[PDB]
Amino acid sequence: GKDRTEPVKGFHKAMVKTMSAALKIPHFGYCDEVDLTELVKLREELKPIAFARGIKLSFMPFFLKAASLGLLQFPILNASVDENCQNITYKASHNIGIAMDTEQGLIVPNVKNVQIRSIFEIATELNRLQKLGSAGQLSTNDLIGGTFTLSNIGSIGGTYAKPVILPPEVAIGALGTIKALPRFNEKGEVCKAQIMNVSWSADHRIIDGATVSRFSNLWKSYLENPAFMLLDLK
Amino acid sequence: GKDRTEPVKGFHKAMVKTMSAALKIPHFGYCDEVDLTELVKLREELKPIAFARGIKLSFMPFFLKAASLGLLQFPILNASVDENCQNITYKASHNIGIAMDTEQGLIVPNVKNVQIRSIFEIATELNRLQKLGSAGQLSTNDLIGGTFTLSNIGSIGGTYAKPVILPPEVAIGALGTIKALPRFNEKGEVCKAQIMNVSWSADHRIIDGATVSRFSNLWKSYLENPAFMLLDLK
Amino acid sequence: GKDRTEPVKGFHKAMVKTMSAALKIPHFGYCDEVDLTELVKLREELKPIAFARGIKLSFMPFFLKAASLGLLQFPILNASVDENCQNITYKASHNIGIAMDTEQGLIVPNVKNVQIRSIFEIATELNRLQKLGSAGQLSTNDLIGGTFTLSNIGSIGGTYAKPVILPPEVAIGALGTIKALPRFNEKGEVCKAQIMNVSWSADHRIIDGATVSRFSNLWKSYLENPAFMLLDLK
Amino acid sequence: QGLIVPNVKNVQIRSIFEIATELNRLQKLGSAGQLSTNDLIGGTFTLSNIGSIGGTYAKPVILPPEVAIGALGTIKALPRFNEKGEVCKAQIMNVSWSADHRIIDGATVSRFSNLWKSYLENPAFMLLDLK
Ligand SMILES: CC(C)(COP(=O)(O)OP(=O)(O)OC[C@H]1O[C@@H](n2cnc3c(N)ncnc32)[C@H](O)[C@@H]1OP(=O)(O)O)[C@@H](O)C(=O)NCCC(=O)NCCS
Numbered sequence: 001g002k003d004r005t006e007p008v009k010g011f012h013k014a015m016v017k018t019m020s021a022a023l024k025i026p027h028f029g030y031c032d033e034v035d036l037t038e039l040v041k042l043r044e045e046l047k048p049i050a051f052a053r054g055i056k057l058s059f060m061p062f063f064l065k066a067a068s069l070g071l072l073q074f075p076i077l078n079a080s081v082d083e084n085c086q087n088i089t090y091k092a093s094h095n096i097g098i099a100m101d102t103e104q105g106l107i108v109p110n111v112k113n114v115q116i117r118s119i120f121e122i123a124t125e126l127n128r129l130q131k132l133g134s135a136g137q138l139s140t141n142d143l144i145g146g147t148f149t150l151s152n153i154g155s156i157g158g159t160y161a162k163p164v165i166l167p168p169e170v171a172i173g174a175l176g177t178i179k180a181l182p183r184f185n186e187k188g189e190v191c192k193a194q195i196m197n198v199s200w201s202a203d204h205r206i207i208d209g210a211t212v213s214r215f216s217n218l219w220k221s222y223l224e225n226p227a228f229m230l231l232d233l234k
Numbered sequence: 235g236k237d238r239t240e241p242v243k244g245f246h247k248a249m250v251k252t253m254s255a256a257l258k259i260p261h262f263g264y265c266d267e268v269d270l271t272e273l274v275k276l277r278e279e280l281k282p283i284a285f286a287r288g289i290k291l292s293f294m295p296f297f298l299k300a301a302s303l304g305l306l307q308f309p310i311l312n313a314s315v316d317e318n319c320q321n322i323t324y325k326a327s328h329n330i331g332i333a334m335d336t337e338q339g340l341i342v343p344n345v346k347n348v349q350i351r352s353i354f355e356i357a358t359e360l361n362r363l364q365k366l367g368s369a370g371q372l373s374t375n376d377l378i379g380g381t382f383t384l385s386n387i388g389s390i391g392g393t394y395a396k397p398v399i400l401p402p403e404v405a406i407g408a409l410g411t412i413k414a415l416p417r418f419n420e421k422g423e424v425c426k427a428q429i430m431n432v433s434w435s436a437d438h439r440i441i442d443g444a445t446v447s448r449f450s451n452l453w454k455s456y457l458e459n460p461a462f463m464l465l466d467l468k
Numbered sequence: 469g470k471d472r473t474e475p476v477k478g479f480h481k482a483m484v485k486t487m488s489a490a491l492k493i494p495h496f497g498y499c500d501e502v503d504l505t506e507l508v509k510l511r512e513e514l515k516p517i518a519f520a521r522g523i524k525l526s527f528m529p530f531f532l533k534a535a536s537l538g539l540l541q542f543p544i545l546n547a548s549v550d551e552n553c554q555n556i557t558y559k560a561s562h563n564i565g566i567a568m569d570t571e572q573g574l575i576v577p578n579v580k581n582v583q584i585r586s587i588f589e590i591a592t593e594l595n596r597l598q599k600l601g602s603a604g605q606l607s608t609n610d611l612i613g614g615t616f617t618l619s620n621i622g623s624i625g626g627t628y629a630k631p632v633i634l635p636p637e638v639a640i641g642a643l644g645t646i647k648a649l650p651r652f653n654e655k656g657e658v659c660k661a662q663i664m665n666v667s668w669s670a671d672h673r674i675i676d677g678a679t680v681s682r683f684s685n686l687w688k689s690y691l692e693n694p695a696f697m698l699l700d701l702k
Numbered sequence: 703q704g705l706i707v708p709n710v711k712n713v714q715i716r717s718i719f720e721i722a723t724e725l726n727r728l729q730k731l732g733s734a735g736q737l738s739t740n741d742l743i744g745g746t747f748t749l750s751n752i753g754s755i756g757g758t759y760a761k762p763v764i765l766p767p768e769v770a771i772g773a774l775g776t777i778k779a780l781p782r783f784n785e786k787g788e789v790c791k792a793q794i795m796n797v798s799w800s801a802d803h804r805i806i807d808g809a810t811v812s813r814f815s816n817l818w819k820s821y822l823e824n825p826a827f828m829l830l831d832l833k
Pocket residue numbers: 058059060061098099100101102106126130151152153154155156175176177178179196442443444
């Protein structure tokens with residue numbers, strides 16, 4: 001009924017400082033649509049097996065493993081730049097941030113070394129961070145050393161987004177809601193296709209659009225043809 | 235064949251000032267598509283009733299009243315922050331700005347206290363502002379006090395946008411053109427669906443993606459099912 | 469492996485400077501889809517005529533000629549602004565940047581005076597630029613004096629993007645990948661439409677949404693209805 | 703020369719791609735008569751792809767001191783039912799395992815075979831635990 005002023009305090013101060021710092025980064029945005037039909041079917045087949053082992057298996061572990069495979073080819077997306085952008089540190093660990101919605105607000109823990117982990121282990125680490133995240137119990141180790149971030153806003157809604165990069169990282173992807181849309185198959189007939197949008201943001205000071213685009217294409221081909229991931233996993 | 239330099243003068247100086255101030259805000263972007271099939275039908279049905287009371291009825295009154303109801307659930311989107319972003323002021327009045335194209339060109343008056351007004355009253359105040367707007371006779375009062383803004387760029391063109399927040403506001407929505415697209419109904423059949431895109435921008439220092447995605451879903455659920463708006467109005 | 473630090477060197481030093489400068493600009497973004505079915509058909513029937521004259525004809529000469537015709541109507545889009553945005557310098561030449569991918573990364577040469585050239589001359593000039601580009605042999609003159617940029621990221625992938633304006637330019641366009649999507653014709657039948665996305669960014673200090681929108685529409689009508697371009701060409 | 707049995711080392715740490723790379727290496731060496739000592743020794747288990755020439759079932763002989771072997775027949779297209787009861791083109795392969803019955807029982811070979819087979823029938827089940 002009246003106006004009400006109220007201090008920004010406690011953990012809310014971190015979002016302020018992080019996003020203010022991100023003003024220093026000139027964001028380039030690139031978007032695509034990915035055809036997740038085969039992946040929806042794949043995830044249905046594997047959901048039981050995961051369930052029997054005590055794991056809820058969403059799409060994220062796939063998005064994460066495909067990201068990491070992309071980062072092997074485009075290691076500049078898993079990198080950091082210094083205050084003046086004079087040097088790049090290419091980071092070897094894929095510590096991939098999971099932006100996560102909580103009752104208390106936004107928090108971003110990461111899954112360490114996705115590069116050495118199976119989809120199933122990623123699923124397992126996810127659950128763990130989700131349980132911990134919702135209980136206010138994430139450790140300091142869960143919150144530091146992130147190298148790259150994915151923000152599945154699509155578990156709530158959306159198509160495209162424009163996500164803000166977390167310094168000191170240089171890139172971030174946001175995933176919209178998987179939605180059934182009419183599309184052509186190879187014959188030229190209209191099918192039910194499960195389509196998801198992706199929105200990447202990158203530090204345009206050292207990352208150009210061809211790089212992001214080729215990264216996205218590789219990422220995309222892994223999810224549109226999960227077979228492709230089999231070739232090189234161990 | 236000749237280059238020409240020219241001062242920015244008169245009202246044009248205002249846009250320079252606003253948009254420069256907007257650089258201090260780290261913009262988060264979030265987008266979605268909204269099925270406006272029922273609302274187009276609803277509006278057709280109200281057009282003659284509105285005409286007879288001497289009022290042009292577009293979609294904007296629907297959008298506005300839906301935004302207001304949303305803001306009641308997410309008051310943080312109707313708020314300001316101070317210079318260093320250390321205090322939030324939750325504003326009680328929904329004075330929703332209407333970005334308006336005129337011959338001189340860009341101006342943003344607002345409809346005061348939407349939260350107390352019917353769709354019909356919002357139509358009436360909108361007409362009044364359009365009348366004064368295209369004659370260059372908007373008063374001072376119609377221009378100050380904005381708490382939130384909608385930008386109907388879709389009356390001219392477009393799908394998605396990246397609109398820029400008007401300080402000291404913290405969010406803004408842009409609406410693209412309502413276009414007929416092939417979409418699936420519940421029965422799995424390809425229908426004619428009246429799709430509109432919306433793109434929101436919000437001050438990421440204090441507003442996370444979950445909050446805007448939820449606000450967006452609520453707004454959207456009101457427009458996708460106008461019925462639901464019936465439920466709580468007096 | 470292990471982390472590796474490394475200096476930013478050589479022609480990479482340019483992208484850091486340029487993209488930092490772009491922070492001074494409040495970017496407004498506006499996107500649309502454009503139906504290229506007719507242009508695809510047109511281009512197919514001109515390919516053999518261009519090949520026979522020694523030239524590869526992509527869609528870019530069409531996009532560039534349309535853009536130029538658009539800039540004649542909305543010349544504020546081929547303009548620059550001074551250090552504090554006090555004066556606008558409208559530029560007569562349309563020297564249109566072609567964002568271009570090479571082994572050494574991103575380079576932006578331009579085609580000089582598009583306004584006075586034919587679709588075939590543009591293509592010729594574009595080809596001269598591709599040959600020099602991929603040889604790393606572009607000259608200083610090919611690189612300076614740009615007034616406006618198009619970025620055909622779609623030759624690699626994508627739908628929408630958020631391209632960054634190259635100062636002292638004031639606008640940029642990004643084109644996504646042309647892709648067959650189910651769309652309605654006038655008769656209300658579902659058919660195969662070659663859809664391309666376009667994303668525009670403009671310096672919102674002096675250019676409003678209405679302006680970009682109208683420009684985009686004109687640009688778009690030239691591409692949707694290629695014969696509209698006949699009318700005023702000499 | 704006749705029959706030769708080199709092995710791919712440490713399949714358990716290699717990817718399908720690297721396994722194929724090593725197969726190519728061995729096929730080439732093997733057909734030049736150049737397989738080396740180290741390629742011939744340390745075998746722990748054996749596959750006999752006789753189906754690259756012909757066959758359905760087989761009775762392969764285990765190579766001591768290993769305790770098991772599988773032979774694979776020729777993949778051929780046979781009428782099979784799908785999940786609806788309709789008749790489909792199905793690419794069928796037979797497998798034959800021999801095991802040392804002094805220590806391996808039939809449930810073991812069967813359970814192992816079920817598992818091997820679910821990986822092949824449902825390749826994405828292999829996705830789940832590879833790194
Ligand atoms: C932490 C988080 C990423 C976990 O995501 P997750 O691995 O998908 O796990 P969730 O438990 O939330 O989701 C599981 C369910 O939602 C569905 N879902 C998740 N992502 C989806 C998508 N993009 N499209 C459609 N459905 C989706 C899953 O299919 C699953 O449904 P089912 O259980 O009926 O099979 C998610 O909870 C979250 O916090 N999202 C918000 C991120 C955010 O706030 N971003 C903005 C940053 S400013």
